[PDB]
DNA sequence: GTCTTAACTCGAGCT
DNA sequence: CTCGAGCTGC
DNA sequence: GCAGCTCGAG
DNA sequence: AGCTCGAGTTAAGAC
């Protein structure tokens, strides 16, 4: 019978706030509108003024202030058959806010208490004894008001998209298409944003960053989100935009989704004695990653046999990209056969006798030598098959490299 | 997931002022759905005239140049907006979020239409490139290839005929011109593997994607390692409401197909160099939809 | 037969970014390898010289406001040490099928619109609009400030077909009137080609190259890049110039806005010259919006009447309506 | 609370400011508005250190 | 007829950056290929020369400070070991249409302004402003500190038409009075050319090249860039230069009609007659000489101020700015 | 964690150091200060490799 | 029903 | 002011 | 092996 | 200490 300790409490907790600005001329016409309202009438305004707003989790407004559409709260769907992951795997922690008039927002804060100390969100649609025994309000008003408190969580009564709703077509298997009218996922957005609030500038995460700065090891893990992008959607004013956005800063962080060539470089590789040197951030980072696994034992024969093999594949592919961006002297001569300079057709024999069947395939050995000069020649694993099997990995990778090299122009 | 008989390769397609958001929680290269629908629309206009079938689209990103400015307060970048025209009332315009960037991409079109044999492959390629130029991809203009240098033609290669030696030689020849850019493919296997791996900690799916796509540091120091470039992508649109007849949905731009309110569904994609893939057809993205369940995904099943 | 709640038209005559470079007028005809203009940073020190808000009775307060100057870091683009000619290169495409709506709610409305469009085309072709666009392309109206104070402006338009061959034309912006449109054989040919492209020939590509004589070390005026986010710290750039491929350029839409400056039939026509083809005849620079909706010249009103009520407006209004449809937007 | 009130043409600029030493930010905002020598300047309230507290455009409301 | 909240005037007489180089005064006739002055860095120590708080000023505080000296890095540009002449090259253009507003909210205001401007031009031409500008171009006022302590300063102003040199001019900055404007045939011709250009009678392009004798290995004073490092010099293409605005500010040192008649002499045309170095702004708004008041009265109320004030107003319109509300 | 504590006249030098093998840098800093054998030397902490971790002048605080 | 401006009360610095 | 962590004596 | 004590950063 | 000012906040006319 504790519901009254929430309704008669929260409202009384609310009235006391309505007294800070209340004079003897206002305390009279507000006495029964607040004091007695805590009993039955403060809720009367709600069930009468709940149709003004609408609790939802996916809205249309974020895509334009002028647009008008249909907001939705219901999401029981979850058809994720392979790893797929989105708004359909929350279940709980569904933090939802309202859509409508800016006049009344605390009316929703009263409904927001549907979990503040009990399972009242389940009682907001059932458990009438909670309202008919503790709240002791009539079922003709209380449970009827409970309906208008549930009607706030459903559509106004008509479906509709808009000309700016950002619709699409969509094909089907051998038959005619269907079109979707997607919306904004406020709930998932807020879940992610709370995660980011917690990790980006949390207390424990900040302490872990301090530990990384002081080179001190303790039992905690911290991560960094770079290259976020800020979206100032909803307009300058929080009002006229999603209430959750208004509660938050009003800017939605977007996780980077760029390809590996976003921050391009100014191609300048005409250093000529430095043919295989070619040092850049990706190259040196891959080299440091290899040397960091070179300081491991053979207890991870398999683990270090793939990550390092995949890594050298990445390295040779990055060298291929170097060559490509070049395409578009002795130390560059054999490289002039690997790094075909301009696909030179001018030279008669230097381009059809020194290149026709003359793909200097020693460049692979040049690069293997540069790598052996990069990753230390620690004999700790050379005695056993650890570094010898690493050499075999290198060898077969460079063999596939030369297989791809043979046919530059042949 | 039909096996494509032949593949048409658009050598280079430049785009200016494209759509760089492509998703509520991510920004960057446009969603693959945009390309699948693009190829579908091409089939919709030229496919009927030439009686060809296009279902597979390959993606190679040659150049990506965004329009962003880094603020001095934080390390989070922002986009460069445009100026909207003055409203009719005469008051100042309202600023709205938008994105623009320069994207140079090359597309691979899987030709499943049997009619290809009835027409010259080179002519089909030229005709397709002509329509491709006038079309608008990702929400921005497609700039045709006009410059001081010679133009870049479209090469069509048949993958049904020939010995494995000729097939491999042709595939190698194609990769030679597609090397400057990196391809895009969807990897959901690792995502599910990690989900089961970290299920003990908490049964959170979004958390796993967030944790995987970040610089993870462990206390010891060291930085967590990933096998390749992994990034979130809009895997598809899950059904958010039941289907409604075209009349029920107001302001629908078409009365032929019913409207459905959907949400966003993510995944985990990987950027792999063309040389790693042996068969190009496994790279092509194919859209598959289920009428009963609202799951619509563009992931390429043949890659696995 | 009501209107369609959803109407959209893909824009036509969509240009691309405009790259810039510098060089010598002598080599302009024979050299197209001119190096690009790189953006640079400069500092400026200022004395507040704007209008006053406080009572103008404060002598020493004003002196103190002076002694506290203003500092800001800006971006400027200037030609090389020895360069008197500016080059701008941008392409332009004509898609066609202007009247063809991209999306329409009702089929009947779309058919009715197409019928009205066909009637208009039969009565009179787009030759008027094509000729107006021809003038804009010939002259440097797309250029905003570079044209002012120019000795000789030379525009060269090449129609790029699959191959390099083209019906290359050459004009003079200064000789051609900026505020007046005159007929010429070359202009007519170009207008005809544009009209064909607009009708939906299938492919149209126009490479525009401009050469403007400004002076050695002169300052060009590219399009300032908007941000909308000032920043939480000091030491920033209060002017960012748009640059692509480490070269300055002008936004595609800013060029496409100037190219469609054919609305000369506005009601006032009292001293004002050509105006941008925009709904409600809005103008950003002047800050006023001509053609308010109360009158009948409004685009929405004219189109609704001419479609539903079949009221044929003046030939001028019909041209304006077709121009707006070409520009595209969201209606209903 | 020491607050430095500055005026500039553009929101991004460096100029000296008077030390108000007011109790709260609302006070500094109203003080800057009451004591303004120009129309196009942008009032910018800043603490004793280099951290920017808030700014206000001529035709816009306070923003942080 | 209230004023327009939005008023802007594109600047006229817009110069370019001013590059610098060195050479021998003898070779002055042929000055091309001369190597530019490259900025360099030099360590420099400091000490306590500023004003101490007599309370914070104590015997041992000084011993501490001077025993802990504030090092500093700065940038200076000096001529080569054997070089006595500095060279400055900057172009100048005359656009015209000074009165023509770039943007105006109300059409009536723009028309009224144009009418007043046309009336002024008809009554009297820009010959006065052009003649005053001519003096600044002839003399080295554009140079700020390089002129000080110079043996001989020779300015050469050419005229470029269609890529050819229409007419050249050679003057002497020292002989021409800095604070006094005297009439001369060459100055009059230059003023006529400038007046024609502003009125819109034809394109005007002026290449200004100055040669000043300072001394061997002397230290030039280029324009300092905005801010360890204290002083940062502005270099373009690995060459020192002077800012465009800094030159256009000096070229417009035409305001000598102030209400004080002090010995300061020429003042730059700036609203409210502000001066940074002197730290005082003449023509305060309390008086009627302020630019804003003058324009408001002479446009809206048709009150024609003195001819001098009209010249000042035209100079302000030429300078450009942001007006209204 | 092997940390090399060195003493030198100028920040730029190559002089050998003792291997402390402490857990964290704060420990190495306190140890270096407590074990400084000279007044005008410049403490330089470096890892087992040649990478400079931090340096501290006689009259100045630690820098990274 | 709706959003807007003009209105209210509110708080802090000169003379 | 309070707060870590290497050395030496029991 | 153990722990009181000293020292120096925050 | 009365009064000024502006910030914060209110609610009714008009669409």
Author numbering:
A (entry chain A): 3, 12 to 280, 285 to 342, 353 to 434
B (entry chain B): 3 to 222, 239 to 322
C (entry chain H): 25 to 356
D (entry chain J), F (entry chain I): 3 to 66
E (entry chain G): 25 to 251, 260 to 357
Task: Quote what the paper states about this structure.
Here we set out to determine the mechanism of immune system suppression by the previously identified, but mechanistically uncharacterized, anti-CRISPR protein IF9 (AcrIF9) that specifically inhibits the type I-F immune system in Pseudomonas aeruginosa. We show that AcrIF9 inhibits the crRNA-guided surveillance complex (Csy) by sterically blocking the hybridization of target DNA to the crRNA guide. In order to determine the mechanism of immune suppression by AcrIF9, we co-expressed and purified the Csy with AcrIF9 and determined the structure using cryo-electron microscopy (cryo-EM) at a nominal resolution of ~3.9Å. Overall, the complex maintains the previously described seahorse-shape, comprising a hexameric Cas7f “backbone” that is capped on one end by the Cas6f “head”, while the other end is capped by a heterodimeric Cas8f and Cas5f “tail”. AcrIF9 is a 7.9 kDa protein made up of a five stranded, anti-parallel beta sheet cradling an alpha helix, a fold distinct from AcrIF1.
